[PDB]
Ligand binder design. Sequence first.
Ligand SMILES: C=C1/C(=C\C=C2/CCC[C@]3(C)[C@@H]([C@H](C)[C@@H](CCCC)C[C@@H](O)C(C)C)CC[C@@H]23)C[C@@H](O)C[C@@H]1O
Lengths: 240, 11
Amino acid sequence: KLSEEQQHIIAILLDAHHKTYDPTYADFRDFRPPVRMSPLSMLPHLADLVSYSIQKVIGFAKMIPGFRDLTSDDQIVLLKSSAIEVIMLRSNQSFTMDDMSWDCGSQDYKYDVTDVSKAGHTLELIEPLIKFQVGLKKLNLHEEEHVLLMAICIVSPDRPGVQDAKLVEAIQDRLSNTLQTYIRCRHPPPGSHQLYAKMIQKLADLRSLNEEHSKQYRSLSFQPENSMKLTPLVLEVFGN
Amino acid sequence: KNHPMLMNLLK
Ligand SMILES: C=C1/C(=C\C=C2/CCC[C@]3(C)[C@@H]([C@H](C)[C@@H](CCCC)C[C@@H](O)C(C)C)CC[C@@H]23)C[C@@H](O)C[C@@H]1O
């Protein structure tokens, strides 16, 4: 059963997420407008969306129980390596299997494979990303499991450059145990069948997506002309 | 390796 501490963790993570993820997507109006027709016509809008989302992921991360006990340098390394992954995970909330797209409240803010390819990426990465979203959606995670997964993804002890890897592991373990116990107590079968193992598998899938993303980002941001379309935060976090 | 913006946001 869920200890009081574990119920505490879930309460905090649910709240941290509610304060960093606006389901009405009201702020999208502040982003450079999307252009759908210039093989990079969607880059300004999506780069802004990503930059905005990186900020939200950071705000979420700071509220993770135990994250505070980490050093500044370890916090930076965890966020720099997990950002794109948490953005992919958090995006599952707007992803819809109806037409394989991310529905953010309006046709203008509804993205599909065509839109993403107009941000400077190829199917080498987009197809796997869509496949990832569909598999994750089919897990019908409870919001509780969704927030714990994102937290577990952020506090990963094996990210390169990590110093106090054991502290990072201790912090992660506490989240994992909360998750495993939560599934056993609050998630009814059959939906709970190997659900933990399947969630950890998505993290593995994210490592592959992260890897391919780093390669394509290098390519895209290779020409100063395109890196010029990004934001200062996106450049600092993803590199260059 | 300097991430001033990321650091400022992490607090
Ligand atoms: C953000 C959020 C959302 C969707 C994320 C998407 C869908 C459209 C395309 C996005 C924004 C991808 C980008 C186009 C990146 C491409 C990922 C590889 C296909 C591009 C970056 O390499 C960089 C050039 C900015 C990353 C995640 C994808 C919607 C909502 O759920 C909030 C969430 O924070």
